[model samples]
Target: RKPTALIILDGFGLREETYGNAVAQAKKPNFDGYWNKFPHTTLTACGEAVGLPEGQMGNSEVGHLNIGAGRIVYQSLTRVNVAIREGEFDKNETFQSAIKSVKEKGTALHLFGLLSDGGVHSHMNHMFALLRLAAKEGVEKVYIHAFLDGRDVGPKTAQSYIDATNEVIKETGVGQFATISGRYYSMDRDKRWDRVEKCYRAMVNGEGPTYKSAEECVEDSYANGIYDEFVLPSVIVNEDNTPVATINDDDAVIFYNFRPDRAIQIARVFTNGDFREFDRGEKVPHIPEFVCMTHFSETVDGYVAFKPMNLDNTLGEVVAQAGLKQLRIAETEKYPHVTFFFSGGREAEFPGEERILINSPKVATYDLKPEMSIYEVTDALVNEIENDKHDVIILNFANCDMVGHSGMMEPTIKAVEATDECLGKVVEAILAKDGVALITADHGNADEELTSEGEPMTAHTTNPVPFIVTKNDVELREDGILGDIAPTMLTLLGVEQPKEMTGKTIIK
Candidate 1:
């Protein structure tokens, strides 16, 4: 009945093992206060709830999407593959526009993505389909910037993918392999901006080990003890010994991976008008027409080749239609979730929805700087709660997950501690305003830090996350999943769950 808030403690999960449990090790008075004093329950965040195969760990992209969608938004692997088989991939508006631009403007079409048959981040079938499409469309010039995958398939099997790709290029008669690199640079899910920058410079600036052919590059890498996944970036050169090609203005660039996480950072350099995360400084000629394989994010500003099924009557949409003001706050790292993913993959904002994006720390990694912009994000959220009139507010604390990704136990513990300290202030602000709120997490990370043999696993877990309600009158069901959150939040806000939301509210 009063102002309502939803706080996503990103990657903060629960487990009783005290061995290397950062969440258990961290001093969390506020976190414990709410869990101990309020009506709380555990919500499944991984496996079946997140659209992953059973036993698969939850990732931020899938976890946050499910939380906002109020239903399982299954992975887009099948739909895109089905479109490929149905010939719809060839007729996609974005793909056709890419061909149209390159054909009319006399510019090269650059294709880049993970080279694999893993069917996880990428697969060879999609790349083959795209190459065949380029040739069938009569595009004059097409370039492939290949990322060698090893972990997804067999190690040291990059030669097969490379030979197959080169064969496909010759078979198509409209394409050439221009560059080759390891998956580390091209598909870093972690915030490895330096690696991403190296990948970007390889494509845009043609800066990497010069090679006559990709086969030679792989042979050289193998001799140097670097395997498929660690193969250093190699630039293909023309007969004149100059790098073959680089992205030019008015050209079309399509990243082939349908999975969105690893593609977002590199996509930013191409589409963002004022991108400043890395030093592009006169290296990039100009922004090109960049298209992602799927809706990676609203901030990336790239066209989606295959988008998720549009979610109607989302939490944001329902609250907006009710004419209630909502405030969304988070650091740059997780802001997209609270805005784009939280809005059911839509790029536009709802009416009366305001967002505050705090810039994350400009560091190489979060291991040393355990508290990554949580202070700024906390202050912004607290100020809004104390000063503003928003009826519904959502904020994400990124420290738990961002630092958790660092895979250092001590730093991750400190990250959880910092998050807990900040949570105290945020909850006080909400309580002072007599507002109701829900505290939960997207998925698990900090809760389990050690492997079976006492090592940092450096992976998201399949464990459940805590869902604690701050209000007294509200009753929570004993069991639920992440998708149940939005419907549950609506019940707390006294807003009716729209028919589009298939999830039943956890509030009974």
Candidate 2:
């Protein structure tokens, strides 16, 4: 039996339409050659296939977790979606306490989250539900910290969400819109504390550029060629040029971002007392009550009714249990895809687990460096394969996903070509070691644009991902979900899949 090397290409998919599909438009000779020569098939990576709410698009966190766990686990979006649909929000203890704090303590109920219907991080309906609940609970004042979303929604559509939000606020007459900023400004995962600092300055001190309204801010952004919602940080102000509200002591603050990446940094600032990651200059407000809607970080302590699924037999844990040595390598952007999300959101390592995280270059924009760290990732994988020490090697190439987010077709195409080139090198290395390589993707991003007009949507797609097995004798399935990847990889590694794993091995 040959050793197994699983290559997860983040954001690569199988759609062939060239209108906006970067994967089809790009020159990917290696990927195309492998698809034709190897036993390849398609797998469902989006929506209910991966345990998300029906019609909800797939995300990297959910896709990676599903691939690693070999089972369907309810993610944050699904959890909140279920809560709202079943009318369980009113009965939830956490919701009751947040509203109670606002009512009894006479402090404003502040809502902060991604202001979109994207259903990736935070949904607009969830925010609406909370506003109606606040009104029902007799809360005096409410403030909203709207995180503009261009990544998961249509580009240059911040005005649409802002307009819809105004309707919600006007109808409910419960809360006043306080501030508006792009999700990108605050929600970086690469330890860019400077970005987080800038966001905090805007939220707390109202120090960023001021705007009369969300409309003016977005219009100004378009005029200045800054159409990305995440880049424009603006403070909602009155005619007197003053912020609607600022977070103060004893205020009930709820951060509604369900995803952990961008939420972790803000959560740390709120909960961690030492607070020395980056200097917060002068205007530091002492907030008595701050609660994250969910646990942004597994290590952080805050208000969270739900947690990422805890599996007893993830691919990593199971491999370690079977006395198999495993090596996981990725750039900083996708390091967690293999380690954290792939291991069912695990923060610790198993006995035989060795994870190598290569630092990604600190750049202002990803499109500027479309070939992000692929060489480093490939070098690490090749060196590991050459060493022939590990029984399993798991690798992630983040270029397709990271650069694709910029929505620039040319840069994304370049990223795809770069990914294809690196993949060719890694495959050769794996074959030289008499190991079989499994190439697949967590979900789709570079496959399709957000709209028909050909502008980059900067969001994940509902398209199926390609599953190419390098071995000649292996039988491929006609249809499968991301959950089936782990079992298939384990089978290739000459190990029996755990009984708890819900996915079926495709190899007959």
Candidate 3:
């Protein structure tokens, strides 16, 4: 008889590469050691083999909980975004309270979010939808704080933002503005994109003629005696199709992206702050040479941030403690309890009743950060089993998903080791509690499989992800895709599989 029951190692996946960086090459003994001993199987993380919305990809939050709960849900973040667009917040009490300050302070309507429709972390469609609704409600001006996304979406999606912003301006018939915060370089440096800088440089350098387009100027930047990639494209173009340059600051500025990671830097540069914590510990954001005003907040500068406060910690407590009053298990029922391990952009901070955050970070093919939540999740699991007990656990460790979105390998490998360690912790804890554990990913990224072939750039692979499982007493390999995990988990827990679930049980 199982003493405890199930323990899920959310988001435990990795890549194999010695990224050029020193940290990426460093050893992860705990992670590697666990892999060598456990009966491991590789499974599909994304693509056709893994069941996902057509034309959509898998993300960290969706990957872990889908495997844990044994059911495929319409994306959680997507569902929430849809609600916001549907005017659900018109009836939300707390939401109204939060915005009261914005109204009282006469803060400009700031709309910050990912600049793409990648939909993995942030979605342009979602943001556009919100802005349209806000405009319909008589919100006149808006400030678009855009973040650079090279992970869930492609790097060149910056163009998409330009297209979207123009659409908003056309639809709203207002003096809406879009500003590029910082490009490729981390926020620590300065708020400079190639085209913007080029415009400024040409004006200051007394060059032959001013640039017509950033693309034209970037071609001969070095010989022009440019120190950096000092040119950036204008979001809007004049009737002559020339970029509309911003020399003075007249309109309001707002940060709109609901996601947080990259917004930290964008917010720092736009708003008033010591700029110490948001940047590289001691860096101050360069102030532009514009004419007049600047304001300050404890954290923010002249800019205003419109972000949704996280409701998760409260939800987690409610769901985790719900078992005390009622049984979380439905032994005779199928798909008893679904737990979500939230991962993705900063906007993923909002929580549901049965959600847990693995605190996963974005991984680059080049460098993985050290403070990732993959380790924290595993450590928490180990503690949970030792001090507390539960019937089933669904985890979403989002290392690979986040890093892969960056389209780099350095952090991807480190992400792999961190995920491996998470799995090991689950296995060890499961053994201690005499329970079973499952480890898998929602989709695949960071691989030899390229999105396209020669000449074109590489991105998320369209290959099928591998599915692997290990338990306290037995080891099994399911020769199937992600859709198969739901039924398999039901069989493992001795429950009836739901007819609604498309997956079949491959484990005995």
Each prediction's RMSD to truth: 10.1, 9.3, 13.9
- Encode model 3's per-residue lDDT on 1-508: one tens digit a residue: 2323333322233445433221134365654454465555565555333335455555544554444334344443444454565667344443333234335544445454445666654566655654664565555445554444555654344555556666776876643433333233322234443333332232222223334333333333434553121223224333564434332233233333444443344445444434433232222223321110112124444432223323222212332333421011111111122232421112222222223334334543324473356565666656656764455555545445445445444555566666656666666777677666555545555442222332221244443454444553445564555546656655666556544455556574
**Model 3 spans > 4 angstroms off:** 1-42, 45-57, 61-370, 448-459, 472-478
Per-residue lDDT over 39-105 for candidate 2, one digit per residue giving the tens place of the 0 to 100 score: 9999988887888878767888888889899987776777777777888876778777767776777
C-alpha lDDT of residue 350 in model 1? 91
At residue 352, candidate 2 shows an lDDT of 88
The window of 10 residues in a row where model 2 has the poorest summed lDDT is: 281-290
> Which scores better on TM-score, 1 or 3?
1
Candidate 2 stretches with Cα past 4 Å from truth are: 76-308
Pick the winner on lDDT between candidates 1 and 2: 1
In model 1, which regions exceed 4 Å deviation?
78-117, 121-152, 155-308
Q: Which pairs of residues collide in candidate 1?
A: none
Model 1 reaches what TM-score against the true structure?
0.60
Candidate 3 local Cα displacement, residue 162, angstroms:
28
Weakest 10 consecutive residues of candidate 1 by summed lDDT: 281-290
Quick one: best TM-score, which candidate?
1
Task: Give per-residue CA lDDT, model 1, range 316-397, as digits (tens).
Answer: 8999988999988898889889888888888898999998899989987787899989898888788788785799998889
